[PDB]
Ligand binder design. Structure first.
Ligand code: A1EAJ
Ligand code: A1EAJ
Ligand code: FE2
Ligand code: FE2
Lengths: 255, 261
């Protein structure tokens, strides 16, 4: 008979993780990616392509590893009796993943391509990466897929969270905090890509993916005893820490 | 580079898969559950309650272990480059799971309760098990929670498929072939449960879980799309054969309970 933690012990867990996202520099003010996406004057097609290829790999990994995380938790609930409040938080994970995988939310079902082309890392690849690729060399395209070390480190932790029953809770809790600021960075940055002084991204609907996301954008409800509460907090710290370092790695490349 | 098998090979796989479902005697005319559901004159509260408790546990594990099997495949896809056809088959599996977990299909959202009360095993527990449970003694309730052996072997094989990248494809392939006949059978069985002289299910809306399933399975008019080489194809067929046989024996167990002496 699994239950979530009591209400006040769960609210205490929400402050500790909000204080862990603070301590990791993931707010709009404190992370170099967000400022750089505002302050930089323009961005070369090679730089913007490389960031777009890294983002494609990272958001692909996030989608598949959060789903694997949900699966790892499904494995547990198959053998125990979760109470209805836990099942409610479980559905929430399934619904949220369904945006990136299926475009469930109305913000996405409008503009997103149908079928697999609307999976968010594919939609991104098709409408951001691909128009930029035409402006860089084959050698640059190969170089961009050799991911930098802080990007590789985040993907490595994502693969570990794919096997952890709280993995999907840890990943969604941190990524939904920062998702809005990331998509705003991208709207600035990819407006500022000029090939021959001319913007690669000129029309409005070239930003379909970025705009839908800026429009669109509790996980503690999946923590069942106080021990799991502590492994939650620990893993968020590690996870926020690596997300910050990889976002900083974006900023260093735009300058 | 990670693609499905050529359409020619996938049709051979699909034909081998229908052969295994035939050999397992899961078809409408084959399986003792469907026959018994047609034939019996009445069903006792205790017998119907027991089959419902068994079904609650079976559809719960089916939902969770298919989702877990989908998670297993996602782990692989995180580090490979699945092409669009694979990605389309992966989307489909996620959508079908959403029927039981979130009532995604409009035939279910039309009638199901919202939130976790609408998860199909919970919904069944609330609308089928509970009113039967008012008509059985506490000792009979406890006894029904002791799952017979063929039900336990099926649950255990579900647990094994929960880790297999092919698991969700295997479970949906078999279950989507028999779901209509199962739902039809439940409709007949629970239509025949009498308590005083009174039907335990005397109002149309009490059948809403079953009728919704019957409508979803009817109204609608593949999984081999997730197979990426010959070796996975052989494994697929082999696991379908195991899993189909275990469903058949578990349904035969329903049929035996409804024809007890
Ligand atoms: C905007 C940030 C995200 C992680 C999006 N959900 C995506 O699709 O990349
Ligand atoms: C009718 C058979 C099924 C597996 C249904 N999907 C259910 O929820 O039990
Ligand atoms: Fe997204
Ligand atoms: Fe169902």
């Amino acid at each position: 008979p699994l239950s979530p933690l009591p209400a006040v012990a769960r609210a205490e867990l929400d402050a500790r993780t909000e204080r862990e996202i603070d301590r990791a520099r993931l707010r709009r003010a404190d992370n170099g990616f967000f400022r750089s996406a505002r302050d930089v004057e323009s961005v070369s097609p090679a730089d913007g392509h490389a960031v777009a290829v890294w983002w494609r790999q990272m958001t692909k990994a996030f989608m598949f590893t959060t789903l694997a995380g949900l699966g790892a938790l499904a494995r547990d609930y198959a053998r125990r009796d979760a109470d209805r409040e836990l099942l409610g938080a479980f559905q929430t994970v399934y619904q949220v993943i369904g945006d990136d995988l299926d475009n469930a939310a109305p913000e996405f079902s409008a503009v997103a391509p149908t079928g697999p082309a609307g999976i968010h890392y594919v939609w991104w690849d098709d409408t951001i990466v691909a128009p930029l690729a035409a402006h860089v060399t084959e050698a640059d395209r190969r170089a961009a897929e050799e991911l930098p070390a802080p990007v590789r480190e985040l993907l490595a932790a994502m693969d570990r969270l794919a096997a952890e029953p709280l993995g999907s809770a840890v990943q969604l809790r941190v990524v939904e905090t920062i998702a809005l600021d990331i998509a705003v960075g991208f709207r600035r940055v990819y407006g500022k890509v000029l090939a021959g002084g001319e913007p690669v991204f000129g029309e409005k609907d070239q930003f379909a993916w970025i705009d839908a996301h800026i429009k669109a954008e509790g996980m503690t409800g999946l923590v069942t005893d106080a021990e799991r509460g502590e492994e939650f907090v620990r893993l968020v710290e590690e996870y926020a820490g690596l997300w910050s370092a990889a976002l900083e790695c974006f900023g260093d490349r735009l300058t």
